[PDB]
Structure formats: structure tokens, C-alpha cells
Amino acid sequence: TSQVRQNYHQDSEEAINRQINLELYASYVYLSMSYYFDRDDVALKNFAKYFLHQSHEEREHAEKLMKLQNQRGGRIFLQDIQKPDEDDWESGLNAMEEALELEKNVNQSLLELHKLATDKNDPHLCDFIETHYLNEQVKAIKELGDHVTNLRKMGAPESGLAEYLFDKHTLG
Amino acid sequence: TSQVRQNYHQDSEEAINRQINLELYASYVYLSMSYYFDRDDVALKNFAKYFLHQSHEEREHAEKLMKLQNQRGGRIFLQDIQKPDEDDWESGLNAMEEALELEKNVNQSLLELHKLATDKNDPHLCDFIETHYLNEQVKAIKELGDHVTNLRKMGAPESGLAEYLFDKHTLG
Amino acid sequence: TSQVRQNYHQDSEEAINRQINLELYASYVYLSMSYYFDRDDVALKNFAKYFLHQSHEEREHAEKLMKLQNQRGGRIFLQDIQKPDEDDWESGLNAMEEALELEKNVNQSLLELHKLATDKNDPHLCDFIETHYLNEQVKAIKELGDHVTNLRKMGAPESGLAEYLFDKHTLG
Amino acid sequence: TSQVRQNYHQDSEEAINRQINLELYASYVYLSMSYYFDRDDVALKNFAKYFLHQSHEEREHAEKLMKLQNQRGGRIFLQDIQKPDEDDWESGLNAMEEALELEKNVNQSLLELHKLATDKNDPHLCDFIETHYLNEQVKAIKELGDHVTNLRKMGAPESGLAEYLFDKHTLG
Amino acid sequence: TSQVRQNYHQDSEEAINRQINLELYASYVYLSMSYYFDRDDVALKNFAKYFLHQSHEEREHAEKLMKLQNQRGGRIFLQDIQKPDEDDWESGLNAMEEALELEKNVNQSLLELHKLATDKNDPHLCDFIETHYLNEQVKAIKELGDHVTNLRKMGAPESGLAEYLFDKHTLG
Amino acid sequence: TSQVRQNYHQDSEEAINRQINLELYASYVYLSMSYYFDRDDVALKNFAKYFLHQSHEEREHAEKLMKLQNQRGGRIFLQDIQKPDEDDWESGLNAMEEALELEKNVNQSLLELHKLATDKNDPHLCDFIETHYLNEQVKAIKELGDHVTNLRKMGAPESGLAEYLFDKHTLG
Ligand SMILES: [Cl-]
Ligand SMILES: [Cl-]
Ligand SMILES: [Cl-]
Ligand SMILES: [Fe+3]
Ligand SMILES: [Fe+3]
Ligand SMILES: [Fe+3]
Ligand SMILES: [Fe+3]
Ligand SMILES: [Fe+3]
Ligand SMILES: [Fe+3]
Ligand SMILES: [Mg+2]
Ligand SMILES: [Mg+2]
Ligand SMILES: [Mg+2]
Numbered sequence A, B, C, D, E, F: 001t002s003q004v005r006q007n008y009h010q011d012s013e014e015a016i017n018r019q020i021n022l023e024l025y026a027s028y029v030y031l032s033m034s035y036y037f038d039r040d041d042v043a044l045k046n047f048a049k050y051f052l053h054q055s056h057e058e059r060e061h062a063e064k065l066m067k068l069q070n071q072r073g074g075r076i077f078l079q080d081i082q083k084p085d086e087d088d089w090e091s092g093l094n095a096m097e098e099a100l101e102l103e104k105n106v107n108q109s110l111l112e113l114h115k116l117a118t119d120k121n122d123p124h125l126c127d128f129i130e131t132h133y134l135n136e137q138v139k140a141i142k143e144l145g146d147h148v149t150n151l152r153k154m155g156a157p158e159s160g161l162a163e164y165l166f167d168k169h170t171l172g
């Protein structure tokens, strides 16, 4: 048992390792999306930039959880980072829709983690998740929903003009 | 169901609409108080300024709740904003006493909202209320109590000199 | 009778209290419109910003009338602020049309108030209304008319691309 | 009953008085440690500086709890501040080990306080403890563990060179 | 015997340890007074600020004696810091009167310490006490006397207006 | 066939996809090493910083290859990022030795890629590898070799003083 460990359940420690892996997976999904928009046959530079930013933000999310694991005296166990579900993301609209679904899934995982920290009477961990993760997820989800809505209302994905103009005026 | 909605109970959504209305009501109470002190037969300019600031702060409180409703995928339903309970607030002391009672009532509503968010296992909403509302209410209530105490100790409301001097030295 | 009161008819006093309420109603209508455009299924952030500005400007219009009432020795009597006629504003174009109708109804009230002040031989009150309100209304009405025209010519509300682009290039 | 008091259980109020005393005790322990390292026969100036900083931080912790007691309408009852358990702290390693044990004991007290605030449905108090105390304690404990580890790995306390070099390179 | 010790009598060493405790007691008395004035039912923020400053100055007075003990090769032995004689200080005037008595009792201790240092032919210790403590005590006593006089002449403690105005104009 | 593709053999495309994966693996290995040194029972913060920098540099190396694949009209196919071979890196010296082996294995991959590009008469690809990767690998290998040498000469890993001092003076 680590000299620093106090009020930190084994189940919590295991759940934080699972969460680390999910944040790293999200970073990888966004990396894939970014470079799909960099293809010469897609060529939406501001979609590419938006998703590369999101990828680097998710890596920060993962590192902060690694820091937390060590702060509490848990032990980091890394797992393979699974490739994304697609290699071709089809369109700007579809990529936004997929991102929205990813962020809801990551939020579900975080909510389940909070419920476990609540059940184990770990207020530090509950505060960590609330302070650093839950409102980030609500903001992300809202932003992605807004983007999906605009793209749909503009006529995407069948209008290539719509996706072009959104790239310029919203993401640029 | 909104595309962004996740872990957001209908009861919570309804309670946030009620809270919006209460914050707007508080803004209106303070507006009324401000312009009572602007009367030529009351003429306490720093009481007027203090309560106008409080009115604009309460409007911000209401707008942040409207933003939250949309962030979570709830739907804003506005209701009439009821006029305050008085048209003549009698004195600087009485207005402070009434403000103290208003802020305790708004805090009770917020505490009931937090209990509902707890019961519905909505940690995001609990964090929102704690972060942005509960300590604002504790500080407000403490400040108002301090003002009531000083005004009483100085001889208000029968001493018009007391209210004059408090206006200058504490509120000015 | 207030010690400051001079040449201020009771009918004028009562009409100013009605005007205060109407300005506060207009503020509330614009607040409602603002947060409709903040919904995730509407998501036009510059429409939201535009209407939130207008909301805050109408609050200032009410506050200036409250100040006037006290300047002239009238007594403020606040009334409830009725909720707007819609909860869902349908589209950018519809909201602009509704705003245009609201501003013509507020102008009609102000013109009736000026007629009263004229009939009661109150030149200070006539000057106040002219200086601070009547050209503000003419400018607002003209701006809203211009916005309605552009949205219609662009193809709104059926073209969600029209409303998107208007949000960006006119309101942004 | 104070005019400001709302949702603040007598048990909570009593627990905050106990916590005030513990923070003041921790400040005193660190004061003692600081001046042990200032002895001519110990003479580790950066150990002395490190522990004097910690002592002044603990006094701030105590004052913030006193402020909270008054904010909520409780009444401060101070108790004697007990002298530390040692007069001679033996070594840099031993002092760090003792500090680590002190901070775990203070964290246990805070966790028990949070459980009481949870049981009494006092979300303001729970937020106060999470926001201002629990992560401060986790960081402190982690830092102290890191220092203990380095000192041990370097050969302390039997190596006086180890303690000298740690004083210079980590604490200096 | 410490390698630095020279001309430092055991009785002087022991008296310095008593003085350290007394300075830390004085710090605690002022801390208690400060937060009495922070209560919502007292609410004199400049009395609170004044006494919190004095609290921090007495901690520095203790720390300087701890430094001296080590400079001369004496050994620090800390004792418990007894709680003050009151929990409720009654009024601004009463607290000032109590402070004046505390500072005359600390001065008497210091004068007894100087007599000891004189009787043990310790000119370094006599100079230390004179340079750093005796005029500080004379200034403090004179300031407190001045504050007591003004409060009494103004009508305290029966006049809560007196204490309010003193808080503002002398302590603010 | 992409409209941009010219002189880019399928084998080269496929080898670049393998290289992307290997760079992302290297990033993950360094991330693991970093947070091993952040453990409370290891506690070498400059080893942690060093390896976290290397992690971020390997992510940039992967991103540049992804950019290249699109520049040449190849198609990115991501694969899972395998977890590192250890969870516990044992010591500063062992981690450096493991890193040195990792960088020689990445160099061997790059040299095989250059041979392929040479055999397919792809001078643009040869130049890319030389300009951006081969001297980076030589510098990295040389730096790691230098670090291994110093740690061994200092007495690592048995001397925890050696690793402490290396952390401070070379990596700090
Ligand atoms: Cl355009
Ligand atoms: Cl005065
Ligand atoms: Cl060295
Ligand atoms: Fe994330
Ligand atoms: Fe509020
Ligand atoms: Fe208006
Ligand atoms: Fe503390
Ligand atoms: Fe003193
Ligand atoms: Fe690389
Ligand atoms: Mg993001
Ligand atoms: Mg306020
Ligand atoms: Mg919180």
C-alpha cells in the first residue's frame, strides 16, 4: 500500500485506469478525424484544425487522470489504445455526429465513475471529476450539438457548399 | 428529446425554470428598492446604488440559469415576474431586513434544488449550484446581516442621522 | 404632494408608470428571444447576442423613466412583468418580425404619452420623450425593417443557409 | 439563533470549532519543526524555511474556517493549542515522516467533517471543504511522500550528506 | 553545551522559553478578538482588521525570540498555547481595554526578563530586549490608551454610533 | 487513385502507415515512463518531465507522417497503439536503457523505410526521411547513450543518490 493512500478504494483506482484508456481513445478518434479532413479529396482545413485541437485536449485529460492516480497512491496500468471505428468519416456533418456520440459515451463513463466515488464515500474524487471533467463534457456536447444543427440546417452533407462555408465561418 | 440531453431529469428541468423566475423576481425587488432611495423624500444615493447593483447581479444569476437549461437540453419556459411585496420600503434598515429575508428565501429554493439534483443523481447540476450559487448566497446573507446590525446599533430607523452616515461610510 | 412637484399632472405620472412596465416587458421579450437562439436545436449565437443586447438596452430605458418619475416628484408603482406571447420564436426571421411589431407597439405608447404631455402643457416631459425615446424608436424600427428585408430576400426562413449567413455577416 | 443561520446543524458548528483547533495545532507543529532545523547543531536552513512556510499556511487554513463559522452564523469557541509531540525532531527524514503522518491525520478529520456535512444535507459546507481543503491535503500528502522517498533513497538519516544535499537541491 | 553558547545563563534560557509562550498567547488573544468583530451581530470590520494585524505581529515577536534562543545556543521548549479568557469580547471599547491590560502584562514580563538579563550580566540579551521589544510595548500601550480614551469620550460602549464611527475614522 | 498521387508506390504507402503506428507507440512508451517517475515511491520529477517531453515530441513525429501520407495521396489506416512492455520501469537507469533500445528499434524501422524508398526510386520520400527523422534519431540515441553512461558511472541504480543528483543536475 502506498504511503500516500487514504480513502481510495481499489474499485476507484481500477475505474480511473479505465478512464485513462477512454480519454486516450478519444484523443485517437479526434486525431483520425483531423487527418481525414486534411485529405486532398476532402480538404476542409478548419475541420482538420478543430479536431486536432480536440485530440490534444483529450491527451491533457488523460494526463491529468494519470497525475490523479499517482496523487492518491493508486498505480497506473495502461492498456492498448483501440483504433477508431472508422477510417473514412464521410463528411463534416458525419464527423460531428460521431464526435457528439463519442462525447456522450465519455460523459456516461464519467457519470458512472462519479457514482462509484459517491458510493465509496470519496469526496476528493467526486470533486476532481466535477471540477475538471463534468462541465467540460457538458460544454463539449453542447458545442457539438450546435455544430450538428447548423450543418443540418445549411444542407449538409449533400451540400458541399454548406460544409465549405461552415468550415470558413464557424471553424475558421 | 434534445440531442444534448443526458442524465437530466424532467423534475430538474422544471425546477430550473422555477429558479429562473425567482432570480428575475429578486432582480425586480432590488430595482424597486433602488428607486425608493432615489425619491426626493428619501434621498439616500448610496442605498440606491447598492440596490441597483444587486438588481443587475440578480439578472446575471437568471441568465446563467437560462444558459444552463440550454446546455443540458432542457427547455426554457418563462413566467410572469411578480411585482414586489411593497411599493414604499420605509427606511434603509427596513429595506436591508427585507433584502435579508429575500436572500434567505432564494437560498432555501437553491437548497431544495440541490436536494432534488442529489436525489436524481445529477452531479453536474449539483456542482453548478454549489459553484455559482450557494456561496454567493452565504456571502450575500452575511453582508446583509452585517448591514442590519450596524444600522440597528447606530439607531436606525428613528435616527435619520444614522441612515445618512451609513449611506456615506459603508455604502459610499 | 412632493416638494419638487411642478407642472406634473397626475395623468402623466400614471402614464409614466405604464411606460416603465412596457419597457420592462420589452426587455423580457428580448431576453426570451435571446435564449431561444441559444438552444442547441437553433444555435444562432449572433441572433442570441443581438437580442440579449436589446434586452439590456430596454432595462436602461425603464430605469431612465423611473429616474424621471422621481425627478418630477411622481411616485413609482411597479406592476408584474407579463411573460412574452411565445416560448418558441420559430426562426430568425419570425423573431425579427415579432421584434419589429413590439417596437411599433412601444412607439405607439410613447406617441400617446407625448400627446398627453402636450395636452397637459408639460414641455419638460415632451422634451424628455423626444430626446431619449422617439428617435431611439425610429432607429430601432428602421434597423429591424432592414433585417426583415434582408432575411426575406435571402430566402428565410425556409433556407437555414440564409439564417446562418445572416447571423454571421450582419449580426456578427 | 443568528439572523444569518440557515441549514447549519449544531453538530457541524461544533465540528468546525474542532477543525479550527486542529489547523492551529498543525501550524504549531510546523513552527516547532522549523526552529529545530535552525539549531546550530542541525543547521538545515531550507528545511527551516520549508516548515515555517507550512506553519504560516496552516494559520491561513485556521483563519478561513473561523471566517466560515461566522459566515454561517455559528459561534467560534477556541480551545488551547496543544504543544507538539516532540521537542527534538531527530532528522530531516524523521521530520518529513512526522509531517506526513500529521497531514494524513488532518485529512482524516476533514473527511469525517465532510461525512457529517453530507449526513446533515449541508451542500455549502461540503463544497467549502472540497474546494478549500481536500485537494490541498492530497497535494500536501503527495509532496511529503515524495520528500520521504527521496530522503530514504539518498541514504538519510544516517547520511548527513544526503540531508545536506536535499536541503540544497530540493528545498532550496 | 552548544558550541555557540557563551555568557548565556540557564535562567535566561528558561525565561526566553516562557516569553515565547507569552507572545504566542498574545497572538491567540488578538486572533480571538479579530473574529469576534467579524460576527454578523457585531460587524465592525476595521476592529477585526486591526486585531488580526496585531495577531500576526505577535507571531513575529514569538518567532524572533525562537531565533534568539537558537542564536545563543539555548534550546526551545514549547508549551501549550492557552485559550483566551473570553469567548465574547462585549464591545469595541471592552476589547481595547482588554488589549491594553494584555500589553501591560506582556511588558511586565519583558521588564522582569530584562532585570534577569541585567542580574546575569548579559548585555547582548539586554540590548535584544531593548531594541526589539521594550519600545514596541511602549508604543502599543500608548496607542491602545489613545483608542480607549477616544471610545470613552465618544460614548462607547452604549453608543453603537460611537463604535461605528471609530471603526470608520480611526481604524479604517 | 488520388489526383495528387505521383511516384508513390503502394509498398511505401503501407510502410508509412506502419511508421505512424510505431511513432505513436513510442509516444505511449514515453508517457508510461513519465508517470512512473511521478509515483510517490519513485519521485524523480525531472525524469518525469524529460520523458513527458519525449512523449509529446513522438506525437509530433506521428502527425508529420500523417501529413506526408496525405501530401503524397496515400490513405491513412490507423492501428491500435499497443501498451508498453512494462508497467514498472525499475529505475532511472533502466528507463534510459529501455529508451535507448526503443530509439534504436525506431531507427531500424526508419532505415528499412529509406531502403524501400530508395528501391522504389522515390527521392521525395528519401529526402523526407533524411530531413526530418534520421538525424533526429542519431541525436536521440547519442543523448540517451550519454545519459546511460553518466548514470552507470555515478553508481546507478543501486545508488539512489546517483539518480537523485542526475535528476537535478542533468535533467533539471
Ligand atoms: Cl459567405
Ligand atoms: Cl462622520
Ligand atoms: Cl551536488
Ligand atoms: Fe476527455
Ligand atoms: Fe440570485
Ligand atoms: Fe424601449
Ligand atoms: Fe491545514
Ligand atoms: Fe509581543
Ligand atoms: Fe520518433
Ligand atoms: Mg474538447
Ligand atoms: Mg448580491
Ligand atoms: Mg465543487
Ligand SMILES: [Mg+2]
Residues within 6 Å of the ligand: C054, C057, C140
Ligand atoms: Mg434597441
Ligand SMILES: [Mg+2]
Residues within 6 Å of the ligand: B080, C080
Ligand atoms: Mg399579474
Ligand SMILES: [Mg+2]
Residues within 6 Å of the ligand: D054, D057, D140
Ligand atoms: Mg502545506
Ligand SMILES: [Mg+2]
Residues within 6 Å of the ligand: E054, E057, E140
Ligand atoms: Mg502590536
Ligand SMILES: [Mg+2]
Residues within 6 Å of the ligand: D080, E080
Ligand atoms: Mg495545557
Ligand SMILES: [Mg+2]
Residues within 6 Å of the ligand: F054, F057, F140
Ligand atoms: Mg526525442
Ligand SMILES: [Mg+2]
Residues within 6 Å of the ligand: A080, F080
Ligand atoms: Mg489490437
